[PDB]
Ligand SMILES: Nc1nc2c(ncn2[C@@H]2O[C@H](COP(=O)(O)OP(=O)(O)OP(=O)(O)O)[C@@H](O)[C@H]2O)c(=O)[nH]1
């Protein structure tokens with residue numbers, strides 16, 4: 405009676421992958437954290453979805469959609485997005501994998517990646533860009549829901 409979506413959250417260490425997932429799962433922001441996956445049931449456009457979420461193998465090759473996360477005060481995390489996308493394109497053998505680019509930590513003032521750099525990168529890949537804060541919860545639902553919608557756009 406519900407539809408499963410297998411989602412994988414990738415990106416450089418420290419960008420807030422666990423925090424974003426924990427925000428989705430328990431509606432709270434964890435300052436310090438620690439080895440498995442999470443399930444969440446959520447209605448998205450009138451469909452009961454069971455999200456199966458891996459934070460950071462089986463999931464990489466069977467994942468249906470990817471959140472590619474960098475932090476907006478970590479220029480290197482942003483630069484490394486290319487490596488994460490090439491990896492995904494390799495291990496799914498397609499140039500057209502459901503994916504959302506997420507720029508996390510928007511609450512922080514120390515901002516070294518501009519919204520234009522990020523908009524440019526996402527436009528080049530043909531994917532949505534969503535800005536988030538795991539701390540304030542801004543954008544978190546939006547990122548996961550938009551990923552579900554990209555998966556649907558691609559396959560039944
Ligand atoms: N201010 C702020 N801090 C955040 C945010 N997201 C995560 N952090 C902090 O950044 C640090 C790293 O967050 P994690 O979720 O552990 O990062 P991760 O990407 O899962 O790191 P790995 O699991 O090592 O790959 C932690 O101290 C978090 O509290 C955010 O949106 N805003």
Ligand SMILES: [Mg+2]
Pocket residue numbers: 421422459460
């Ligand atoms: Mg993590």
